[PDB]
Amino acid sequence: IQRRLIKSMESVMVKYDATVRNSINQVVQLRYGEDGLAGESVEFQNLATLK
């Protein structure tokens, strides 16, 4: 399963346009994680104004 997942996404990367495109420049996401943000620099937080 891991190898099959990797071989389907191994060329998907964030370009200098800040968008996410595969090897053939087809756009997968306009921003990485639909926010353009790195996954290693985020935290868990609470929305105070909610409920």
Binding site: T19, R21, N25, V27, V28, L30
Partner: peptide
């Protein structure tokens, strides 16, 4: 705006 051609979109 995005400087991409017609077939590169999802």
């Amino acid at each position: 705006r995005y400087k991409l051609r017609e077939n590169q979109l999802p």
